[PDB]
Amino acid sequence: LEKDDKDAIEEKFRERLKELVVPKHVMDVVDEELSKLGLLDNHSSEFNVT
Amino acid sequence: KGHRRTYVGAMPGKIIQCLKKTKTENPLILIDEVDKIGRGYQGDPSSALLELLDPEQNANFLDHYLDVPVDLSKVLFICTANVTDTIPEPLRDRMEMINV
Amino acid sequence: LEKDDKDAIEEKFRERLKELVVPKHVMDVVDEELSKLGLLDNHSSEFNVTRNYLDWLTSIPWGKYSNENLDLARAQAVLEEDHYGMEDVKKRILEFIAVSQLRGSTQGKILCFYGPPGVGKTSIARSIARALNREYFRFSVGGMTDVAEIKGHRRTYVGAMPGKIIQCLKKTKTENPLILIDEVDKIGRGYQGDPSSALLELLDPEQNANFLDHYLDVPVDLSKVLFICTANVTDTIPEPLRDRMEMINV
Amino acid sequence: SGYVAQEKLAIAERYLVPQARALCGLDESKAKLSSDVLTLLIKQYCRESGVRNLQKQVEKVLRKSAYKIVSGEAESVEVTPENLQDFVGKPVFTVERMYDV
Ligand SMILES: Nc1ncnc2c1ncn2[C@@H]1O[C@H](COP(=O)(O)OP(=O)(O)OP(O)(O)=S)[C@@H](O)[C@H]1O
Ligand SMILES: [Mg+2]
C-alpha cells in the first residue's frame, strides 16, 4: 500500500540526476546515500530524514 | 551554513536555499548593508563569510547540512555598505570597493 | 537467490578488517558487535543503527600509512614551484623531512603560521601536502561553536555519526592525512562548551594519541597527523593553546 | 607553581635532554650541548614558569642538528654560543648594558 517509498523514490531521483552534470565526488556520496536507502526500510525516522 | 542534519529539522544554509529556488548555477546574490551585521554577543557571521567570499577557495564551499564542498565559482556576489569602515580590513580585502 | 543476505555484510566487515592492523582496543568490541548483529533480525529497529556503527568502525582506515618521497633534492623543486619566499617554512620542512627520515617511522606535529592577511597562509598547505604527497585537507574553523563536528553524537540519536575529522579520515584511506584546521583565532564562542576547551585535548602533542570521540568511544591513535593552524593575529588564542603549537610568523 | 632558572637548567640537562634525545634518536655523542649554550638560552629567552617552551627550544636545536647530519656535510654539529645566533635567530631579550664600575 505504497508507491514511492523504496525503489521508485530512488528512481525518480536517479532520472532527475541525469540532466545535471554533477561532480563525480558528490555523485559517489549520492550513490552511497542511494545504497543506504535501498538497505533502509521504507518507513523509518532515518528514512524520511536521509 | 545549516546544521549537522542529525538534528531533527535541520535544513541547508541560506545561499543553498537561495540557489535551489533559482536553477542557475550563476544567480546574482546581493548581500545588502554589510556594515550593520550583528556582533559582540554571538558568533559573528563575518567569521563565516570568509568561507563564502574567498575568490578561489569558495569553489569548495562546505555546508554543515550537506558536507560536500559546493563549487559556486560562477556566482557574482555583491555586497553593499554605505561606508566601508565598519568592515574589518581582511574581509574588505577580498572584494573591490566601488564608490557611487 | 537469497543466499544468506544477512551474512554477506558480516563477511564484508570481515574482509575490510582483514587487511587492517586493528588496534587492540577495537578488535574485541568490533567482532562482539558483529556477533550481536548476527543474533538480531535485519529489520530489527536497532539493526540499522548497529549496521551503521559497524559500517563506520569497519571503514575508517586503521594504520595504513603513505610512505612519502624522501630525497630532499627533488623536494626542493616541488617546494619552490608554486611559491616564492617563505624560506623559514622551507627550512622547517627541511627539518621535518630530515628528522622523520632519521627515526624510521613517520611522526606528526602541529604548527601555526600567522601574519598579514593574504600573505599566502591558506596558500601553502596545498603546496606542502603536494610536497610530502600525503593527502591534503582543509578545514576552516572560523566562528564554529559546536564540538560535535570534532566528536559526533551518542548513537542513541537517529543518524548520529562520528565527528567530521573521522569522516575525513574515512575519506582519505591512509591513516596519516595532513589535517588542516584554519583561522583558529576567529573560532567562535559558543557560550556552552566552546570549542577551544575541546580543541586543547586534541592539540596536546602528548594526549592526542588517545583522542576519544563520544560517538564510538574507543581511543584512537592520532600521532601521525601533522596538523596546521592559522590566524591573522595571535592574541585571541588562549595562553596554553598558544603554547601548544609552534608559532611561525609568516 | 614556578621553576627557578637554575632548577630548570638542572631538570633540562638531566631529564629533558635525555628524554628528547631518546625521542629524537640523536646519539648522545653526535649532538653535544654545553650547559653554557643552554645558560644563554635561559638568560635571554625562556624567563617564565613553564617548562614546555624550553622543550620547544631544545627540539629546535636538535632538529637543526638532525637536518645538518641528514643532508649537510659534518658528521657532528658543534654548537658554540657564537654559532647560536643563526640557529635561534634574533635574540628576543637584549643583554643589559653591563657597566663595570
Ligand atoms: N610566495 C607566494 N608565491 C605565490 N603566490 C603567493 C605567495 N604568497 C601568497 N601568494 C598568493 O596568496 C594568495 C592567497 O593566499 P592565502 O594564503 O589565501 O592568503 P592568506 O594569507 O591566507 O590571507 P587570508 O585568506 O586573509 S588568511 C594566492 O593567490 C597565492 O597565489
Ligand atoms: Mg587564507
Coordinates of C-alpha atoms and ligand atoms in Angstrom, one line a residue:
Chain A
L1 CA 0.0 0.0 0.0
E2 CA 2.7 2.5 -1.1
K3 CA 4.1 3.9 -4.3
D4 CA 7.3 6.0 -3.8
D5 CA 8.8 4.7 -0.6
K6 CA 11.7 2.4 -1.6
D7 CA 12.5 1.9 -5.3
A8 CA 10.5 4.4 -7.2
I9 CA 11.5 7.2 -4.8
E10 CA 15.1 6.2 -5.6
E11 CA 14.5 6.1 -9.3
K12 CA 12.8 9.5 -9.8
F13 CA 15.9 11.0 -8.2
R14 CA 18.2 8.9 -10.4
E15 CA 16.4 10.0 -13.5
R16 CA 16.4 13.5 -12.0
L17 CA 20.1 13.4 -11.7
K18 CA 20.9 12.8 -15.3
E19 CA 20.4 16.2 -16.8
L20 CA 22.6 17.8 -14.1
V21 CA 26.4 17.4 -14.7
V22 CA 27.4 16.6 -11.2
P23 CA 31.0 16.4 -9.9
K24 CA 31.9 12.8 -9.6
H25 CA 32.7 13.4 -5.9
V26 CA 29.2 14.3 -4.8
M27 CA 27.9 11.7 -7.2
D28 CA 29.7 9.0 -5.2
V29 CA 28.3 10.4 -2.0
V30 CA 24.9 10.3 -3.7
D31 CA 25.5 6.7 -4.7
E32 CA 26.3 5.9 -1.1
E33 CA 23.1 7.5 0.1
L34 CA 21.2 5.6 -2.6
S35 CA 22.5 2.3 -1.5
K36 CA 21.8 3.2 2.1
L37 CA 18.3 4.0 1.1
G38 CA 17.9 0.6 -0.5
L39 CA 19.1 -1.0 2.6
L40 CA 16.8 1.1 4.7
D41 CA 13.3 0.2 5.4
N42 CA 10.6 2.1 3.5
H43 CA 9.2 3.7 6.8
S44 CA 11.7 5.0 9.4
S45 CA 13.0 8.1 11.0
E46 CA 16.3 7.8 9.3
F47 CA 14.5 7.0 6.1
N48 CA 12.5 10.2 5.9
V49 CA 15.5 12.2 7.1
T50 CA 18.0 10.8 4.7
Chain B
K1 CA 25.7 27.1 6.9
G2 CA 22.7 25.0 8.2
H3 CA 23.2 22.3 10.8
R4 CA 24.6 18.8 11.1
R5 CA 21.4 17.2 9.6
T6 CA 21.4 14.8 12.5
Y7 CA 19.3 17.5 14.2
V8 CA 15.6 16.8 13.9
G9 CA 14.5 19.6 11.5
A10 CA 17.8 20.9 10.1
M11 CA 17.7 22.4 6.6
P12 CA 20.6 23.8 4.5
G13 CA 22.1 27.3 4.8
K14 CA 20.8 30.4 3.1
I15 CA 22.7 30.5 -0.1
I16 CA 21.8 26.9 -1.0
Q17 CA 18.2 27.6 -0.2
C18 CA 18.6 30.7 -2.5
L19 CA 20.1 28.6 -5.2
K20 CA 17.5 25.8 -5.2
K21 CA 14.8 28.4 -5.9
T22 CA 16.7 29.7 -8.9
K23 CA 18.0 26.8 -11.1
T24 CA 21.1 28.7 -12.3
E25 CA 24.5 28.0 -11.1
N26 CA 25.1 31.7 -11.5
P27 CA 22.4 33.6 -9.6
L28 CA 23.1 37.2 -8.7
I29 CA 23.3 37.0 -4.9
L30 CA 23.0 40.5 -3.4
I31 CA 24.1 40.8 0.1
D32 CA 22.9 44.2 1.5
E33 CA 24.2 46.6 4.2
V34 CA 27.2 44.6 5.3
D35 CA 28.2 47.3 7.9
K36 CA 25.4 46.5 10.3
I37 CA 25.8 42.8 10.7
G38 CA 25.4 41.8 14.3
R39 CA 28.4 41.5 16.6
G40 CA 29.7 41.3 20.1
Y41 CA 27.4 38.7 21.7
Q42 CA 27.3 35.6 19.4
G43 CA 29.3 34.0 16.6
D44 CA 29.8 36.8 14.1
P45 CA 28.6 35.8 10.6
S46 CA 31.6 37.7 9.1
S47 CA 33.9 34.9 10.5
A48 CA 31.9 32.5 8.3
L49 CA 31.6 34.9 5.4
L50 CA 35.3 34.5 4.6
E51 CA 34.5 30.9 3.6
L52 CA 31.9 32.3 1.2
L53 CA 33.9 35.2 -0.1
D54 CA 37.3 33.6 -0.8
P55 CA 37.7 34.4 -4.5
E56 CA 39.1 30.9 -5.4
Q57 CA 38.5 28.6 -2.4
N58 CA 34.8 29.3 -2.5
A59 CA 34.7 26.7 -5.2
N60 CA 34.9 24.2 -2.3
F61 CA 32.3 25.9 -0.1
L62 CA 31.3 23.5 2.7
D63 CA 27.8 23.5 4.2
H64 CA 27.0 21.8 7.6
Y65 CA 23.9 20.2 6.3
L66 CA 25.4 19.0 3.0
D67 CA 29.1 18.5 3.9
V68 CA 30.2 18.2 0.3
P69 CA 32.2 21.2 -1.0
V70 CA 30.0 23.4 -3.1
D71 CA 31.5 25.0 -6.2
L72 CA 30.0 28.4 -6.8
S73 CA 32.8 29.9 -8.8
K74 CA 30.4 31.2 -11.5
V75 CA 28.4 33.3 -8.9
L76 CA 28.7 37.1 -8.9
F77 CA 28.4 38.0 -5.3
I78 CA 27.6 41.6 -4.4
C79 CA 27.6 43.4 -1.1
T80 CA 26.5 46.8 0.0
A81 CA 27.5 49.0 2.9
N82 CA 27.1 52.8 2.9
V83 CA 30.6 53.3 4.4
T84 CA 33.4 50.8 4.1
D85 CA 34.8 51.3 7.5
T86 CA 32.8 49.1 9.8
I87 CA 34.0 46.2 7.8
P88 CA 37.1 44.5 9.3
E89 CA 40.1 45.0 7.0
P90 CA 40.8 41.4 6.0
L91 CA 37.2 41.0 4.9
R92 CA 37.5 44.3 3.0
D93 CA 40.5 42.9 1.1
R94 CA 38.6 40.2 -0.7
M95 CA 36.2 42.4 -2.6
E96 CA 36.9 45.5 -4.6
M97 CA 35.4 48.7 -3.3
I98 CA 33.4 50.9 -5.5
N99 CA 32.2 54.5 -4.7
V100 CA 28.9 55.7 -6.0
Chain C
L1 CA 18.8 -16.4 -4.9
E2 CA 18.7 -15.1 -1.4
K3 CA 21.7 -17.0 -0.3
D4 CA 22.5 -15.5 3.2
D5 CA 21.9 -11.8 2.7
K6 CA 22.4 -11.2 6.4
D7 CA 25.8 -12.9 6.4
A8 CA 27.4 -11.3 3.3
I9 CA 27.5 -8.0 5.1
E10 CA 29.1 -9.6 8.1
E11 CA 31.6 -11.2 5.8
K12 CA 32.1 -7.9 4.2
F13 CA 33.1 -6.3 7.5
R14 CA 35.5 -9.3 7.9
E15 CA 37.1 -8.6 4.6
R16 CA 37.5 -4.9 5.2
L17 CA 39.0 -5.7 8.6
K18 CA 41.4 -8.4 7.3
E19 CA 43.9 -6.1 5.7
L20 CA 43.7 -3.6 8.6
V21 CA 46.1 -3.5 11.6
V22 CA 43.2 -3.4 14.0
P23 CA 44.0 -1.7 17.3
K24 CA 43.7 -3.9 20.3
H25 CA 41.1 -1.5 21.8
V26 CA 38.9 -2.2 18.8
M27 CA 39.2 -5.9 17.8
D28 CA 37.2 -7.2 20.8
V29 CA 34.4 -4.6 20.6
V30 CA 34.0 -4.9 16.8
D31 CA 33.6 -8.6 16.4
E32 CA 31.4 -8.9 19.5
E33 CA 29.1 -6.3 18.0
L34 CA 29.2 -8.3 14.7
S35 CA 28.0 -11.3 16.8
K36 CA 25.3 -9.2 18.4
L37 CA 24.2 -8.2 14.9
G38 CA 24.2 -11.8 13.9
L39 CA 21.7 -12.5 16.6
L40 CA 19.0 -10.0 15.7
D41 CA 16.8 -9.7 12.6
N42 CA 17.8 -7.4 9.7
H43 CA 14.6 -5.4 10.2
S44 CA 15.2 -5.1 13.9
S45 CA 14.9 -1.4 14.8
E46 CA 18.4 -1.4 16.3
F47 CA 19.9 -3.2 13.4
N48 CA 20.1 -0.2 11.1
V49 CA 21.9 1.8 13.7
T50 CA 24.2 -1.0 14.6
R51 CA 24.8 -1.7 10.9
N52 CA 25.8 1.9 10.6
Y53 CA 28.1 1.8 13.7
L54 CA 29.9 -1.1 12.3
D55 CA 29.9 0.4 8.9
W56 CA 31.8 3.3 10.3
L57 CA 34.1 1.3 12.5
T58 CA 34.9 -1.1 9.8
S59 CA 35.5 1.6 7.3
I60 CA 37.7 4.2 9.0
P61 CA 41.3 3.4 8.0
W62 CA 43.4 1.7 10.7
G63 CA 47.2 2.1 10.4
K64 CA 47.6 2.2 6.6
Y65 CA 50.5 4.6 6.0
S66 CA 51.6 6.6 3.0
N67 CA 55.4 6.4 2.6
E68 CA 56.5 9.9 1.3
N69 CA 59.1 10.9 -1.1
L70 CA 62.2 11.3 1.0
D71 CA 65.1 12.6 -1.1
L72 CA 65.1 16.3 -0.5
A73 CA 66.8 17.3 -3.7
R74 CA 63.6 16.6 -5.5
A75 CA 61.6 18.1 -2.7
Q76 CA 63.2 21.5 -3.4
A77 CA 61.7 21.6 -6.9
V78 CA 58.1 20.9 -5.9
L79 CA 58.6 23.1 -2.8
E80 CA 59.7 26.1 -4.9
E81 CA 57.5 25.6 -8.0
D82 CA 54.3 27.1 -6.7
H83 CA 55.5 29.8 -4.2
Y84 CA 58.3 32.2 -3.8
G85 CA 60.0 33.2 -0.5
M86 CA 58.6 31.8 2.7
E87 CA 62.1 30.5 3.3
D88 CA 61.6 29.8 7.0
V89 CA 58.8 27.4 6.3
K90 CA 61.1 25.8 3.8
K91 CA 63.7 25.3 6.5
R92 CA 61.2 23.9 8.9
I93 CA 60.0 21.4 6.3
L94 CA 63.7 20.5 5.7
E95 CA 63.9 19.8 9.4
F96 CA 60.8 17.7 9.3
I97 CA 61.8 15.5 6.5
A98 CA 65.2 15.1 8.0
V99 CA 64.1 14.0 11.5
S100 CA 61.3 11.8 10.2
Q101 CA 63.9 10.3 7.9
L102 CA 66.1 9.6 10.9
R103 CA 63.9 7.5 13.3
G104 CA 62.4 5.4 10.6
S105 CA 58.7 5.7 11.1
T106 CA 56.7 8.8 10.4
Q107 CA 55.7 11.3 13.0
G108 CA 53.3 14.1 13.2
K109 CA 53.5 17.6 14.6
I110 CA 51.5 20.8 14.8
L111 CA 52.4 24.3 13.6
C112 CA 50.8 27.7 13.5
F113 CA 51.6 30.4 10.9
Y114 CA 50.4 33.9 11.4
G115 CA 51.0 37.4 9.8
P116 CA 49.3 39.8 7.4
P117 CA 46.2 38.6 5.6
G118 CA 46.9 37.4 2.0
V119 CA 50.5 36.6 2.8
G120 CA 49.8 33.1 1.5
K121 CA 48.8 31.4 4.8
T122 CA 46.0 29.4 3.3
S123 CA 48.0 29.1 0.1
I124 CA 50.9 26.9 1.4
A125 CA 49.3 23.9 2.8
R126 CA 48.3 22.7 -0.7
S127 CA 51.9 23.1 -1.6
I128 CA 53.1 21.3 1.5
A129 CA 50.7 18.4 1.1
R130 CA 51.8 18.2 -2.5
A131 CA 55.4 18.1 -1.3
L132 CA 55.2 15.2 1.1
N133 CA 52.4 13.8 -1.1
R134 CA 50.3 12.9 2.0
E135 CA 46.7 13.6 1.4
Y136 CA 45.6 17.2 1.7
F137 CA 42.7 18.6 3.7
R138 CA 41.5 22.0 4.8
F139 CA 39.0 22.9 7.4
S140 CA 38.1 26.4 8.3
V141 CA 37.1 26.7 11.9
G142 CA 36.1 30.4 11.9
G143 CA 33.1 31.1 14.1
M144 CA 32.5 27.4 14.8
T145 CA 30.8 26.8 18.1
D146 CA 29.7 23.1 18.0
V147 CA 32.0 20.5 19.4
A148 CA 30.0 17.7 17.7
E149 CA 32.0 18.3 14.5
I150 CA 35.0 17.2 16.4
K151 CA 33.0 14.5 18.3
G152 CA 29.8 13.2 16.8
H153 CA 26.8 12.2 18.9
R154 CA 25.9 9.4 21.3
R155 CA 24.4 7.0 18.6
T156 CA 21.1 6.9 20.6
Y157 CA 20.0 9.8 18.3
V158 CA 18.9 8.8 14.9
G159 CA 21.6 9.4 12.3
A160 CA 24.4 10.1 14.7
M161 CA 27.8 9.9 13.1
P162 CA 31.3 10.2 14.4
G163 CA 33.0 13.7 14.3
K164 CA 33.9 15.2 11.0
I165 CA 37.6 14.6 11.4
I166 CA 36.9 10.9 11.3
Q167 CA 34.8 11.5 8.2
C168 CA 37.8 13.0 6.6
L169 CA 40.0 10.1 7.7
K170 CA 37.5 7.8 6.1
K171 CA 37.6 9.8 3.0
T172 CA 41.5 9.6 3.0
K173 CA 42.3 5.9 3.3
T174 CA 45.8 6.4 4.7
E175 CA 45.9 6.6 8.4
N176 CA 48.1 9.7 8.3
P177 CA 46.5 12.6 6.4
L178 CA 47.7 16.2 6.7
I179 CA 44.6 17.6 8.5
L180 CA 44.4 21.4 8.3
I181 CA 42.4 23.4 10.7
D182 CA 42.4 27.1 9.6
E183 CA 41.8 30.6 11.0
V184 CA 41.8 29.3 14.6
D185 CA 41.7 32.7 16.3
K186 CA 38.3 33.6 14.7
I187 CA 36.8 30.5 16.2
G188 CA 33.5 31.4 17.8
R189 CA 32.5 31.4 21.4
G190 CA 29.5 29.1 21.8
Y191 CA 28.8 30.2 25.4
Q192 CA 28.3 26.5 26.4
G193 CA 31.2 24.1 25.8
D194 CA 33.0 26.4 23.4
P195 CA 35.4 24.5 21.0
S196 CA 38.7 25.8 22.4
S197 CA 38.2 23.8 25.5
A198 CA 37.7 20.7 23.3
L199 CA 40.5 21.6 21.0
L200 CA 43.1 21.6 23.7
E201 CA 42.6 17.8 24.3
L202 CA 43.1 17.2 20.6
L203 CA 46.0 19.5 20.1
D204 CA 48.0 18.4 23.1
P205 CA 51.1 16.8 21.4
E206 CA 51.0 14.0 24.0
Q207 CA 47.4 13.3 24.7
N208 CA 46.3 13.3 21.0
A209 CA 47.2 9.5 20.9
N210 CA 44.1 8.8 23.0
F211 CA 41.5 11.0 21.4
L212 CA 38.1 9.6 22.3
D213 CA 35.2 10.9 20.2
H214 CA 32.0 10.5 22.1
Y215 CA 30.3 8.6 19.3
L216 CA 32.4 5.5 19.3
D217 CA 34.3 5.9 22.5
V218 CA 37.3 3.6 21.9
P219 CA 40.6 5.6 21.9
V220 CA 42.2 6.3 18.5
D221 CA 45.9 7.0 17.8
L222 CA 46.4 10.2 16.0
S223 CA 50.1 11.0 16.4
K224 CA 50.9 10.5 12.7
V225 CA 48.8 13.5 11.5
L226 CA 50.7 16.8 11.1
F227 CA 48.1 19.5 11.9
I228 CA 48.5 23.1 10.8
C229 CA 46.6 26.1 12.1
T230 CA 46.4 29.7 11.1
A231 CA 45.3 33.0 12.5
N232 CA 45.7 36.6 11.3
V233 CA 46.7 37.7 14.8
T234 CA 48.0 35.7 17.7
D235 CA 46.2 37.4 20.6
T236 CA 42.8 35.7 20.8
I237 CA 44.4 32.3 21.3
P238 CA 44.2 31.1 24.9
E239 CA 47.6 31.1 26.5
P240 CA 48.1 27.3 26.8
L241 CA 46.8 26.7 23.3
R242 CA 49.2 29.2 22.0
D243 CA 51.9 27.3 24.0
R244 CA 50.7 24.0 22.4
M245 CA 51.8 24.8 18.9
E246 CA 54.7 26.3 17.0
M247 CA 54.3 29.9 16.1
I248 CA 55.9 30.5 12.8
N249 CA 55.3 34.1 11.8
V250 CA 54.7 34.3 8.1
Chain D
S1 CA 53.9 26.9 40.9
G2 CA 57.1 28.2 39.5
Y3 CA 60.5 27.0 38.4
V4 CA 63.7 29.0 39.1
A5 CA 66.1 29.2 36.1
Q6 CA 68.8 27.1 38.0
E7 CA 66.3 24.3 38.8
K8 CA 65.0 24.4 35.2
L9 CA 68.6 24.1 33.9
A10 CA 69.1 21.1 36.2
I11 CA 65.9 19.4 35.2
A12 CA 66.5 20.0 31.5
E13 CA 70.1 18.6 31.3
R14 CA 69.1 15.6 33.4
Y15 CA 65.5 14.9 32.3
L16 CA 64.5 16.9 29.2
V17 CA 67.7 16.5 27.3
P18 CA 67.9 12.7 27.7
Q19 CA 64.2 12.4 27.1
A20 CA 64.0 14.4 23.9
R21 CA 67.2 12.7 22.8
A22 CA 65.7 9.2 23.1
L23 CA 62.5 10.6 21.5
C24 CA 64.6 12.0 18.5
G25 CA 67.2 9.3 18.2
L26 CA 70.2 11.6 18.1
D27 CA 73.3 9.9 19.6
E28 CA 74.4 11.2 22.9
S29 CA 77.8 11.9 21.2
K30 CA 76.7 13.3 17.9
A31 CA 74.8 16.4 19.3
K32 CA 76.8 17.7 22.1
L33 CA 75.2 20.6 24.1
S34 CA 77.1 22.6 26.6
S35 CA 75.5 23.9 29.7
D36 CA 76.8 27.3 28.6
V37 CA 74.7 27.5 25.4
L38 CA 71.8 26.4 27.5
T39 CA 72.6 29.1 30.0
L40 CA 72.4 31.6 27.3
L41 CA 69.1 30.3 26.1
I42 CA 67.8 30.6 29.7
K43 CA 69.1 34.1 30.3
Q44 CA 67.9 35.5 27.1
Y45 CA 64.8 33.6 26.0
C46 CA 62.8 31.4 28.5
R47 CA 62.1 33.6 31.5
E48 CA 58.7 32.1 32.8
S49 CA 57.4 29.4 35.0
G50 CA 56.5 26.8 32.3
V51 CA 58.8 24.1 31.1
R52 CA 57.3 23.4 27.6
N53 CA 58.8 26.4 25.8
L54 CA 62.3 25.3 26.7
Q55 CA 61.3 21.9 25.4
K56 CA 60.5 23.6 22.1
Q57 CA 63.9 25.2 22.1
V58 CA 65.8 22.0 22.7
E59 CA 63.8 20.4 20.0
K60 CA 64.6 23.2 17.6
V61 CA 68.3 22.9 18.1
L62 CA 68.1 19.1 17.9
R63 CA 66.1 19.4 14.8
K64 CA 68.6 21.7 13.1
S65 CA 71.4 19.3 14.1
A66 CA 69.4 16.4 12.6
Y67 CA 69.0 18.1 9.3
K68 CA 72.6 19.1 9.2
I69 CA 73.5 15.5 9.6
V70 CA 70.8 14.1 7.4
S71 CA 71.9 16.2 4.4
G72 CA 74.7 18.5 5.3
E73 CA 78.4 17.6 5.5
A74 CA 79.6 17.4 9.1
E75 CA 79.4 14.1 10.9
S76 CA 78.5 16.1 14.1
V77 CA 77.4 19.6 14.8
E78 CA 79.3 21.6 17.4
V79 CA 77.2 24.4 18.6
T80 CA 79.0 27.2 20.5
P81 CA 77.1 30.4 21.5
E82 CA 78.8 32.4 18.8
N83 CA 77.2 29.9 16.4
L84 CA 73.9 30.1 18.2
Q85 CA 72.8 33.4 16.7
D86 CA 71.8 31.6 13.4
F87 CA 70.2 28.6 15.0
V88 CA 67.9 30.6 17.3
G89 CA 68.0 33.6 15.1
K90 CA 67.4 37.0 16.5
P91 CA 67.6 37.1 20.3
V92 CA 64.3 38.3 21.8
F93 CA 65.6 39.9 25.0
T94 CA 68.5 42.4 24.9
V95 CA 71.5 41.8 27.1
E96 CA 72.0 44.5 29.7
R97 CA 74.5 47.3 29.1
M98 CA 76.6 45.7 31.8
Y99 CA 78.6 48.6 33.2
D100 CA 81.7 47.7 35.1
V101 CA 82.4 50.2 37.9
Ligands
LIG1 N1 55.0 33.2 -2.1 C1 53.9 33.2 -2.8 N2 54.0 32.8 -4.1 C2 52.9 32.9 -4.9 N3 51.7 33.2 -4.5 C3 51.6 33.6 -3.3 C4 52.7 33.6 -2.4 N4 52.3 34.1 -1.1 C5 51.0 34.3 -1.3 N5 50.5 34.0 -2.6 C6 49.2 34.2 -3.1 O1 48.4 34.5 -2.0 C7 47.0 34.2 -2.4 C8 46.1 33.9 -1.3 O2 46.8 33.1 -0.3 P1 46.3 33.0 1.1 O3 47.3 32.1 1.8 O4 44.9 32.6 0.9 O5 46.4 34.4 1.7 P2 46.1 34.4 3.2 O6 47.3 35.0 4.0 O7 45.6 33.1 3.6 O8 45.1 35.5 3.5 P3 43.8 35.2 4.3 O9 42.9 34.4 3.3 O10 43.2 36.6 4.7 S1 44.1 34.2 6.0 C9 47.1 33.2 -3.6 O11 46.6 33.8 -4.8 C10 48.6 33.0 -3.7 O12 49.0 33.0 -5.1
MG2 MG 43.6 32.5 3.8

